[PDB]
């Protein structure tokens, strides 16, 4: 049995920014009240995890990153009611405490218990369950999935279908649900509309899937890497454009393509300039633009508010606007019911020990999602 | 017997920025095809008119300003079908051509024939109906209401109830419809919500009216002029705050007062800093902020897009999101049915000849709306 005991296991520890992950032994404490210790099965490499390494995102170091994953419950702390040992689960990087004003709000999903806005890199109780070489190691978004075992607060875990393929549905922990929800729930893309999607990685392909699902007539993919176009067309893009191919700003190209501006645009990269471009390419009176990409820490954009005064709507979301604990098991159920596909997002499947090579595939432009298997 | 003939009349010509208006004779050409010549009865002084004087709003000079008004049709050009001589009418500074992609969209109102985005200061045909001292004078937003007679394109005028009191209903041509629509149609304020309204002039008072109509529990007026508070309370503010009273920035004050941010915020001033503050003060995950105020020409704001990524929605609108020609007669009908009050906005009445004193009143902070009578 491991229950009630410290587990020594392998994890990918990030000791400082802009360095490879260190794959080594850590000690994982047993779960305290209302906590859940999970044996990881599969975790995806999300660009957000790369932002921690690059310093685009500031979070306390050293850290066990990873937030897109699935695993199997090893043990539960006293008080846990929503999962049990042996359950398949997906950690929730946006929690759902169910009691805060946001949780109670019918649209809101950015639960006030989150560790995103002012990251502490701890459990809800302000402490860490991880040590490495005698030192405490921070958690990341309450999840820390780049470990053979993690401990999460109950509000940061969802039970999923026992028959789920964990090496696919781990994507429901971030990339798929974020893109898909951004289209269907946040933007509320309409039938027959014209959509533009900036950034054709795992998240942007998922936005395309959502736009297609919502019945868009036109879905224009935008990326500087033309290698990403063929997959974007496979999942629903009607045409792809590379800004580098044009003498004019791409907002102008998109406005002409769409005969006056698009219905819905999505920034799915994380650049200040493309957030403004995305806003500008939506139709001035009724367009809607959604920010999905994570921008570099503490940097402001500049824009002209007349872009909004004419009628545009600008919004952003975390995790596709989904209330995380209610939505994740439904999304897995829908996948099992063949309502959407995940295979088009998966380009590479590596063992966990090859985490660094996975991140190099991302950084080189070669991968969409690499799934690491424990 | 004035039909088909040039009319000489007095108008208030603005020859140069930052100068008084010159009340002097102009010649008003007869209407061309699909144009309407209107004998003005009453016109309100809106801060946007003052923006033309200050250079906050750039539009070609010399100009006949004025956009918030009502009058009586003197004559119609060939092909006009929607009004007739002797009809009571409100000029529509935002037109409704009924044919463009915006006019056809269920939620758009910023008709593509507008003269607001890139002002020419002409009629739809690119020419002027106005001469003064033998010199052509520009139109403003297709309305030019600071004249005893104006000529407007048919898509820039609405027939209203023959029994309407024009010295009141002129406010439906801008200030009232704008603020009220901004709350009820653009923001879609909900029952029991907390609203914050930045700027307690005619438009922000109309926003308050709208929020109270929509059933908001709390409506916080924000103004640096505490003289504006009493009227704001009369029309529904539950509490008023002056930023100059506080050591902390007002977004933090509003966030505290609202136990984590308001449901709806409105910028009804026209400053870049208060556009950002107003966004910031709405709840980070599900707050909605609406820009109503008109910013200084060509200036950009600076903001941190993480304010959106958490879940905020930012939008703007012209004329409260109302499709102008459809809405104005319905708004007048509802006023006549006492569905809303216009008297709380009218603080001063003057003859047209005292237009400059009317502007002095607005500039001093003493008036809300001054109505000028021809
Ligand atoms: N809001 C959320 O909850 C949420 C969740 C998941 C991911 N993210 C963010 O979303 C963004 C995309 O994530 P991902 O899909 O995993 O990243 P990714 O796989 O790196 O994809 C980004 C795509 O953007 C492309 N790109 C880079 N620069 C430009 C440019 N100037 N113009 C057009 N394309 C460009 C690039 O070629 C790549 O295909 C990142 O910033 C993530 O941090 C946000
Ligand atoms: N979007 C539209 O269709 C539309 C329509 C009508 C009016 N407008 C604009 O809306 C704004 C309001 O117009 P109005 O109500 O006629 O103007 P107004 O009567 O000048 O009211 C503005 C109010 O803002 C207050 N104010 C000024 N500075 C600050 C500050 N820093 N903090 C708090 N309050 C401050 C000021 O004391 C005044 O009571 C102006 O910019 C207009 O041009 C927009
Ligand atoms: O990809 C999900 C994701 C985000 F959307 C963030 F805003 C963030 F800060 C983060 F760490 C993260 F993982
Ligand atoms: O007050 C209404 C109004 C506006 F909302 C504008 F954006 C504008 F440019 C203008 F001239 C105007 F009069
Ligand atoms: Zn919560
Ligand atoms: Zn992610
Ligand atoms: Zn139109
Ligand atoms: Zn106005």
From Swiss-Prot, chains A, B:
Predominant localisation class: cytoplasm
Annotated residues for binding of an alcohol: 48, 67
Protein name per its UniProtKB record: Alcohol dehydrogenase E chain
Biological processes per GO annotation: retinoic acid metabolic process; retinol metabolic process
Residue positions binding Zn(2+) 2: 97, 100, 103, 111
Positions of Zn(2+) 1 binding: 46, 48, 67, 174
Subcellular location(s) per record: Cytoplasm
UniProt-listed Enzyme Commission number(s): 1.1.1.1
Keywords: Acetylation, Cytoplasm, Metal-binding, NAD, Oxidoreductase, Zinc
MF GO annotations: all-trans-retinol dehydrogenase (NAD+) activity; zinc ion binding
Record's catalysed reaction(s): a primary alcohol + NAD(+) = an aldehyde + NADH + H(+); a secondary alcohol + NAD(+) = a ketone + NADH + H(+)
Annotated disulfide bonds: none
Subunit comment: Dimer of identical or non-identical chains of two types (E and S) coded by 2 separate genes at different loci.
Major enzyme class: oxidoreductase
Annotated cofactor note: Binds 2 Zn(2+) ions per subunit.
GO CC terms, sorted: cytosol
Transmembrane segments: none
SMART domains: PKS_ER (SM00829)
Cofactors: Zn(2+)
Source organism per UniProt: Equus caballus (Horse)
């Amino acid at each position: 049995s491991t229950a009630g005991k410290v587990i020594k296991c392998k994890a990918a520890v990030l000791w400082e920014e802009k360095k490879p992950f260190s794959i080594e032994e850590v000690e994982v404490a047993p779960p305290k009240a209302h906590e859940v210790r999970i044996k990881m099965v599969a975790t995806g490499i999300c660009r957000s995890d790369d932002h921690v390494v690059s310093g685009t995102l500031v979070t306390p170091l050293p850290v066990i990153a990873g937030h897109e994953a699935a695993g199997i419950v090893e043990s539960i702390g006293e008080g846990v009611t929503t999962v049990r040992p042996g359950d398949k689960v997906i950690p929730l990087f946006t929690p759902q405490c169910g009691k805060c004003r946001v949780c109670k709000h019918p649209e809101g999903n950015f639960c006030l218990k989150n560790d995103l806005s002012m990251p502490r890199g701890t459990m809800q109780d302000g402490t860490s369950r991880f040590t490495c070489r005698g030192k405490p190691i921070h958690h990341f978004l309450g999840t820390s999935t780049f470990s053979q075992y993690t401990v999460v607060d109950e509000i940061s875990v969802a039970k999923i279908d026992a028959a789920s393929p964990l090496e696919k549905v781990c994507l429901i922990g971030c990339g798929f649900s974020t893109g898909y929800g951004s289209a269907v729930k946040v933007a509320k893309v309409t039938q027959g509309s014209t959509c533009a999607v900036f950034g054709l990685g795992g998240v942007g392909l998922s936005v395309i899937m959502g736009c297609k699902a919502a019945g868009a007539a036109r879905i224009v993919g935008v990326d500087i890497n033309k290698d990403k176009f063929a997959k974007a067309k496979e999942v629903g893009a009607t045409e792809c454009v590379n800004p580098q191919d044009y003498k004019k700003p791409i907002q102008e190209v998109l406005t002409e393509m769409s005969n006056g501006g698009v219905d819905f645009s999505f920034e799915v990269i994380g650049r200040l300039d493309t957030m403004v471009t995305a806003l500008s390419c939506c139709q001035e009176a009724y367009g809607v633009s959604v920010i999905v990409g994570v921008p570099p820490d503490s940097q402001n954009l500049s824009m002209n508010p007349m872009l909004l005064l004419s009628g545009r709507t600008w919004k952003g979301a975390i995790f596709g606007g989904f209330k995380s604990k209610d939505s994740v098991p439904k999304l897995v159920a829908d996948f099992m019911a063949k309502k959407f596909a995940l295979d088009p997002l998966i380009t590479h499947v590596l063992p966990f020990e090859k985490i660094n090579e996975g991140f190099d595939l991302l950084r080189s432009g070669e991968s969409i999602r690499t799934i690491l298997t424990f």
